[PDB]
Design a protein around this nucleic acid. Structure first.
Lengths: 174, 122, 206, 37
RNA sequence: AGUGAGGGCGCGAGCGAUAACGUCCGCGUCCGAGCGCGGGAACAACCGAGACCGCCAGCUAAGGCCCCCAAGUCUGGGCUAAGUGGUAAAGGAUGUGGCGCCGCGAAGACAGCCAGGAGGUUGGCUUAGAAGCAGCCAUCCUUUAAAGAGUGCGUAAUAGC
RNA sequence: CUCGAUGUCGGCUCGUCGCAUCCUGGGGCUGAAGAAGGUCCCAAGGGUUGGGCUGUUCGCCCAUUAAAGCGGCACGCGAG
RNA sequence: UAACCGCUGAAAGCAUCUAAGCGGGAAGCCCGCCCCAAGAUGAGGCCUCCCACGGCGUCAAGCCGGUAAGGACCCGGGAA
């Protein structure tokens, strides 16, 4: 009824191999997990995740294999770029090539490195983020960077995802 | 050379060139009112007038007798034990005082005044 | 990074604009007496000797163990792993460059047999209000039903001199390439005019 | 915040989070860090 | 002729704090004084059981059968999965599984979605502001996406979600 | 159990484990600006001074200190 | 890895660090640091070297020389 419907457009390399499903698209040969009982098909344009039951384990498993391998696909279709925005009077940014310029620790050496699907985008640099491929590892690295200085609820000067409304509280007494 | 409890000598605005220190002002584990150091004490000896009194200051380490061994293998020993009394900051006590030169002191540095102050013979 | 030696004696010297004290290291130059090839002793390494005490005196075995890659006529020998032999004979006439940091050790001069007194710190007990043991003696050793007995590994009286050991970092100070000698300002680890060795390890980030 | 007990949520919409036998309430207000595992 | 003082367990009253391998009395068993065997790890009194002496005999208690060690790593149907097994209460909880029950307007559901979030809604005080999103209650009307006497981020009302 | 025998205090000397950790760090929280406090969960690693008076350990007081913890072992220690 | 922070994600067709799978992280845990150590009968591993030593009832795992192959003994010396 509902927790298993998805199409596999682009004629993507949509195949199941040694107990691992191989989703190959712009290159992201993404390895989407395959629980032995979940099971799925990709015929015509329709890709379906099945349920060898419906109890707790399985049902969640469904939500997963479905959503996550769904990922495998959408991903293999484009290229996974994380939109991110650096912003704060205290900070600098430029690709440098394969790292993380960055400067707001007032002893700025910030020489980072790009894991993989990770390409650096400095078009601002106020607006500035990265592109990845692997939705999981991408949101992640993004995070790594955010984390390393970003916080600031009461005074801003950080890195922000899309940049949530950053809830902020007063300083002294007024 | 050192001591905890001590009958030491001074010669600043002293009540008497003598006070008894408790211990060393250094790294919490005294045991050595040592050459060129800074420590704690009260008076032992008398004091004609003088705004000094029978109280207690802290201050800095002069002479010793049991090896003033310096960086340059400069070497010495005076058959005398005494330091200069301090007022807070360190800023020495008296206008002058009876004694003289030699590395260790100035070297500790913080007290140049003592430095130029006790120069000549004695 | 290793030197094999006959430790001489400790003495004082001067450096820059100040004196300070060193020690006399002396080593003719050990040589590839035995090699653990790895396929040989996958604990790969070099064993060498560095002098020579009388030949008329020498077990056959020794004679041929030498035979091996054949070298000379001594008796001072020992081994160390993870150290290539970019040679087949070593001296230190450069082997050990000065103005460098080193680590080193040797035999440990042989003490005696003194209790709580020696062996360990804290000089014995006290003396006066009690003299049925005057000044020092053995601390305490356990108790009633705690472990219900006598303990098993706290310091103890006696023999504590016939052993060996080493010192962490020390300075290479100076190199005398002729008389294969080097001054190093060292804890003269163990006697002198006897046996020692040096090795260098310290990826120490200050 | 934590407490080997209590926790009846709070921040008017304070979340009952299941994590490691860890009775942990999660919200949008630090005031509610409810760690009772 | 011997004990003329004894303890334990279960139930029933004391007492004690409804504490103690406490001490008081009673019904029973007990254990000594047989209570020497099984046993529960090993443990005087907790379930089994009375040993006159044999058996390189077989049926059984209790309680056991992957192994250490005799005995199915039986079959059958479940429910937990924390290692509970392998001591604990008060009490806490979108634990796990189970009821015996509630919402299904396929006049096609809920979390996810889209857009509008309607005009009198405009003081009552306070109006510096209520003109739902400042305090003392208001509980009506038209009007359609069906209607918020406006559950909520708020300041100067207000303006926006 | 112990009265055919179990040395009770205070201290000494050598201590050994423990965490409801004092200093240490790791932390979320603040009525958190900074700094600094204070509010809990994690973690014993090392560390966890001198004197004064008092036979008193506790204690009060002098001087510092990063700090100068509570306590288990017949309140460890007489075959020391 | 502790608390504590996150990524990807369902079962709770919006959400969640959370079984699934991934990461951050403590002066603490294994290592790295030195010091013991196959009497770790589960080593000995490598090097050199005397010979497979010589006589005795086969089962010769007993005798004697065998080798100074080597070492012990006594002597003489040692911060051992």
């Amino acid at each position: 009824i509902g927790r298993l419907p998805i199409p596999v457009p682009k004629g993507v390399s949509v195949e199941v191999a040694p107990g691992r499903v191989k989703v190959k698209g712009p290159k992201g040969e993404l390895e989407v997990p395959v629980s032995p009982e979940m099971r799925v098909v990709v015929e015509e344009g329709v890709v379906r995740v099945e349920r060898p039951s419906d109890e707790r384990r399985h049902k969640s498993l469904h939500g997963l294999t479905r959503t996550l391998i769904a990922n495998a696909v959408k991903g293999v279709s484009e290229g996974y770029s994380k939109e991110l925005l650096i912003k704060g009077i205290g900070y600098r940014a430029r690709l440098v090539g394969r790292a993380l310029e960055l400067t707001v620790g007032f002893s700025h050496p910030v020489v980072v490195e790009p894991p993989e699907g990770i390409t650096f985008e400095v078009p601002e640099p106020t607006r500035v983020r990265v592109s990845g491929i692997d939705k999981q590892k991408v949101g992640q690295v993004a995070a790594n960077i955010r984390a390393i200085r970003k916080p600031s609820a009461y005074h801003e000067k950080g890195i922000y995802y899309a940049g949530e409304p950053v809830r902020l509280k007063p300083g002294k007494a007024g | 050379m050192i001591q905890p409890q001590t009958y030491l000598e001074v010669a600043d605005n002293t009540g008497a060139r003598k006070i008894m220190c408790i211990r060393v002002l250094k790294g919490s584990n005294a045991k050595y009112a040592t050459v060129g150091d800074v420590i704690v004490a009260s008076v032992k000896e008398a004091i004609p007038r003088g705004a000094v009194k029978e109280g207690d200051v802290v201050k800095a380490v002069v002479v010793r007798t049991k090896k003033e061994v310096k960086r340059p293998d400069g070497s010495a020993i005076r058959f005398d034990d005494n330091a200069a009394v301090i007022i807070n900051n360190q800023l020495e006590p008296r206008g002058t005082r009876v004694f003289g030169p030699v590395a260790r002191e100035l070297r500790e540095k913080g007290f140049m005044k003592i430095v130029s102050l006790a120069p000549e013979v004695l | 990074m290793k030197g094999i030696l006959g430790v001489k004696v400790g003495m004082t010297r001067i450096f820059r604009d100040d004196r300070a004290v060193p020690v006399t290291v002396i080593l003719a130059g050990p040589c590839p007496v035995v090699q653990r090839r790895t396929p040989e002793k996958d604990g790969y390494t070099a064993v060498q000797l560095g002098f020579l005490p009388q030949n008329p005196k020498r077990v056959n075995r020794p004679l041929k163990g030498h035979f091996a890659k054949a070298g000379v006529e001594p008796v001072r020998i020992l081994r160390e792993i993870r150290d290539f032999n970019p040679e087949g004979d070593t001296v230190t006439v450069e082997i050990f460059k000065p103005g460098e940091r080193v680590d080193v050790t040797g035999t440990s001069k042989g003490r005696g047999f003194a209790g709580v007194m020696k062996r360990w710190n804290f000089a014995g007990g006290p003396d006066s209000h009690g003299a049925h043991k005057i000044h020092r003696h053995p601390g305490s050793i356990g108790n009633r039903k705690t472990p219900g007995r006598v303990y098993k590994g706290k310091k103890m009286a006696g023999h504590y001199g016939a052993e060996r050991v080493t010192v962490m970092n020390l300075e290479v100070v100076d190199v005398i390439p002729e008389e294969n000698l080097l001054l190093v300002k060292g804890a003269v680890p163990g006697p002198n005019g006897g046996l020692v060795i040096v090795r260098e390890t310290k990826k120490a980030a200050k | 915040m934590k407490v080997r007990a209590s926790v009846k949520r709070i921040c008017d919409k304070c979340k009952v989070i299941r994590r490691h036998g860890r009775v942990y309430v999660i919200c949008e207000n630090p005031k509610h860090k409810q760690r009772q595992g």
